[PDB]
Amino acid sequence: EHIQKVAIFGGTHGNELTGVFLVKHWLENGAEIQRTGLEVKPFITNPRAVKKCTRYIDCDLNRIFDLENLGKKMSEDLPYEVRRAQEINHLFGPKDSEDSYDIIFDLHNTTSNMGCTLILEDSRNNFLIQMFHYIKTSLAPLPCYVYLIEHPSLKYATTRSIAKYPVGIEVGPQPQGVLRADILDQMRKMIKHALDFIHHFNEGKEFPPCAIEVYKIIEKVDYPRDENGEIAAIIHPNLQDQDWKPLHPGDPMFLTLDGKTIPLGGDCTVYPVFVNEAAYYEKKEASAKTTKLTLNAKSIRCC
Amino acid sequence: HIQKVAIFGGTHGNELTGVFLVKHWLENGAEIQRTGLEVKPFITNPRAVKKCTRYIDCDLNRIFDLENLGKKMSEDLPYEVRRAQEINHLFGPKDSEDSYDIIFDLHNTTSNMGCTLILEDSRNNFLIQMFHYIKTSLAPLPCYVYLIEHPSLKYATTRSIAKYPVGIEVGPQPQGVLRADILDQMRKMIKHALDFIHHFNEGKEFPPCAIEVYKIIEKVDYPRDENGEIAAIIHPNLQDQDWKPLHPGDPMFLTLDGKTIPLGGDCTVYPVFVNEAAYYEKKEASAKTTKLTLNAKSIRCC
Numbered sequence: 278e279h280i281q282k283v284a285i286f287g288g289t290h291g292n293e294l295t296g297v298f299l300v301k302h303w304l305e306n307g308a309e310i311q312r313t314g315l316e317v318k319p320f321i322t323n324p325r326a327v328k329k330c331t332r333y334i335d336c337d338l339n340r341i342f343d344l345e346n347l348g349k350k351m352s353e354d355l356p357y358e359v360r361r362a363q364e365i366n367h368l369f370g371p372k373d374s375e376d377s378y379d380i381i382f383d384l385h386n387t388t389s390n391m392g393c394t395l396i397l398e399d400s401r402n403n404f405l406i407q408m409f410h411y412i413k414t415s416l417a418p419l420p421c422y423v424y425l426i427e428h429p430s431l432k433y434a435t436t437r438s439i440a441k442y443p444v445g446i447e448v449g450p451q452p453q454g455v456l457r458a459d460i461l462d463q464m465r466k467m468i469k470h471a472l473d474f475i476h477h478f479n480e481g482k483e484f485p486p487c488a489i490e491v492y493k494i495i496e497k498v499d500y501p502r503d504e505n506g507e508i509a510a511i512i513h514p515n516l517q518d519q520d521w522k523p524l525h526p527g528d529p530m531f532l533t534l535d536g537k538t539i540p541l542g543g544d545c546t547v548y549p550v551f552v553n554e555a556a557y558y559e560k561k562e563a564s565a566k567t568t569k570l571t572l573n574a575k576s577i578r579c580c
Numbered sequence: 581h582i583q584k585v586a587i588f589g590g591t592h593g594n595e596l597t598g599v600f601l602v603k604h605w606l607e608n609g610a611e612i613q614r615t616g617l618e619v620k621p622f623i624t625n626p627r628a629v630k631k632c633t634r635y636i637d638c639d640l641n642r643i644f645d646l647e648n649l650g651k652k653m654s655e656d657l658p659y660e661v662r663r664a665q666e667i668n669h670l671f672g673p674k675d676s677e678d679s680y681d682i683i684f685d686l687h688n689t690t691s692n693m694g695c696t697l698i699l700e701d702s703r704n705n706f707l708i709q710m711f712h713y714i715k716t717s718l719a720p721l722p723c724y725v726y727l728i729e730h731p732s733l734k735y736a737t738t739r740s741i742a743k744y745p746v747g748i749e750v751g752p753q754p755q756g757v758l759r760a761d762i763l764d765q766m767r768k769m770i771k772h773a774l775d776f777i778h779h780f781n782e783g784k785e786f787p788p789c790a791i792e793v794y795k796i797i798e799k800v801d802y803p804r805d806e807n808g809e810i811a812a813i814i815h816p817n818l819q820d821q822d823w824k825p826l827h828p829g830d831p832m833f834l835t836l837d838g839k840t841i842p843l844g845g846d847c848t849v850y851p852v853f854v855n856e857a858a859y860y861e862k863k864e865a866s867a868k869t870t871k872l873t874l875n876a877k878s879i880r881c882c
């Protein structure tokens with residue numbers, strides 16, 4: 278390949294502050310994210326949401342980088358994030374074109390207890406799978422996990438999907454509208470190793486094949502509800518904070534006030550991720566369920 | 581002779597535990613009723629609960645003062661000012677003797693505070709006695725008393741209407757989130773508070789008692805840019821360390837470059853509301869308090 282244009286996005290969601298805080302400082306001083314032989318542009322994707330310290334103004338930005346929206350006629354009637362998405366496509370894409378950026382990192386926080394998390398959009402992309410393995414390995418003994426969101430119908434159109442090689446970086450648990458120092462330090466390490474990986478690769482380092490554990494989306498699940506549609510039971514204490522860890526069909530999952538336990542059910546184990554993410558109450562996702570599988574990558578090298 | 585008791589929920593609309601309890605209790609109040617004691621549950625800010633946001637126009641829990649409660653009712657007022665009146669009329673009026681006797685106001689914080697109780701008056705013997713019974717009942721689950729009375733720095737709360745205003749605060753919890761363990765703690769806190777009222781209305785005698793409280797002295801902001809932007813954040817040694825002592829040597833903030841900013845001044849303090857999401861706009865990274873003992877006379881009733 279050889280890797281030319283790399284961006285780092287922060288503030289895709291305005292109330293996930295770690296990225297906004299990093300990105301604002303790197304806009305004032307890029308040293309940390311520069312590598313010799315490699316320019317990297319930091320950028321604030323949703324500045325209006327950042328100012329109102331809110332997830333979004335009109336709709337969720339990280340859901341709408343698709344043809345329906347990016348091809349619409351530009352006007353003032355449109356939702357702000359739609360208007361905004363096109364401006365980003367124009368500056369860092371166009372999506373699906375060779376004139377696009379090569380790599381975009383999109384920075385995020387979650388209220389779920391997920392630790393360092395990388396988000397893989399493509400199960401058979403050797404370059405990204407090698408990146409993630411490098412990062413995992415470099416972070417150790419600190420855990421790092423890979424959420425694979427590829428699905429026939431459930432994959433959503435991300436800010437970073439613009440890029441040839443989209444990457445999502447997600448670090449929790451952190452309350453919305455808060456800057457924790459230990460979370461901050463973790464996003465930074467994550468990024469440090471990713472950029473190290475690119476540099477290495479660009480200087481013609483050869484990577485043997487690798488393999489990684491990832492968690493593949495199967496199904497999102499809502500909180501159980503009323504006939505009024507109000508929440509009837511919450512995340513059971515035993516499932517609280519147990520993102521990534523295996524959940525068997527008899528195991529507790531929800532809890533009513535009364536309080537009776539509602540268990541998992543079905544006839545196979547699953548790995549929950551995004552357990553009790555604040556921003557998903559709105560989307561009716563109390564938890565995602567994943568299967569854990571191992572992916573391989575071929576060798577890769579530059580020129 | 582403690583007649584009217586209310587439990588308020590959703591003073592802040594994104595602090596979900598209270599909303600969840602109050603909405604359930606409205607449908608079946610058995611948990612909070614006691615033998616010969618009628619306690620009304622109520623949603624203070626229903627519109628902010630609908631949007632799942634702290635407030636709409638301004639913070640409901642600061643404006644139960646004369647400045648706001650004396651305004652002429654009108655569609656042009658900020659929503660929360662209109663609500664503060666409506667509420668005052670139902671459960672007050674504030675400073676009258678027709679006002680409710682006890683109001684419990686339920687809250688959540690992103691700060692690591694555990695079970696906490698907000699004392700608005702350092703003299704009230706009844707509260708001190710209640711707060712002793714709860715703290716003690718809860719043990720060894722820790723429970724703490726934050727005393728916010730102060731010449732200039734006390735703010736006009738939703739519960740300040742009542743003769744006996746009680747704030748109930750549990751954390752750490754993210755806004756927009758219902759955590760089971762937090763839910764459980766909050767309702768053990770109420771269990772014991774209502775139990776104490778019942779014990780008092782059954783004539784049971786309470787001897788003198790002392791408790792430790794944390795008295796406000798001042799609130800500090802995050803250090804800032806030339807542009808008013810945040811330039812340091814809560815140090816990792818201070819993160820989640822509410823209530824624990826912090827000496828002038830000790831570290832308070834951290835910059836992106838790695839620079840540690842120490843406490844300074846001349847005495848130990850006990851910080852409270854360390855890194856509370858909602859106080860970023862109020863420019864209070866933390867509040868500093870001194871540890872203090874308060875004594876209550878014994879009490880009975882008739």
Ligand SMILES: CP(=O)(O)N[C@@H](CC(=O)O)C(=O)O
Nearest residue numbers: 290339385386387445554556
């Ligand atoms: C909790 P979040 O909003 O950072 N999660 C992202 C997931 C992602 O980065 O794809 C989203 O929901 O758009």
Ligand SMILES: CP(=O)(O)N[C@@H](CC(=O)O)C(=O)O
Nearest residue numbers: 641687688689698747856858
């Ligand atoms: C973090 P919070 O909104 O529960 N704190 C209360 C403090 C209180 O209960 O007096 C407030 O800011 O009004």
Ligand SMILES: [Zn+2]
Nearest residue numbers: 290293385386
């Ligand atoms: Zn996000």
Ligand SMILES: [Zn+2]
Nearest residue numbers: 592595687688
């Ligand atoms: Zn509150």
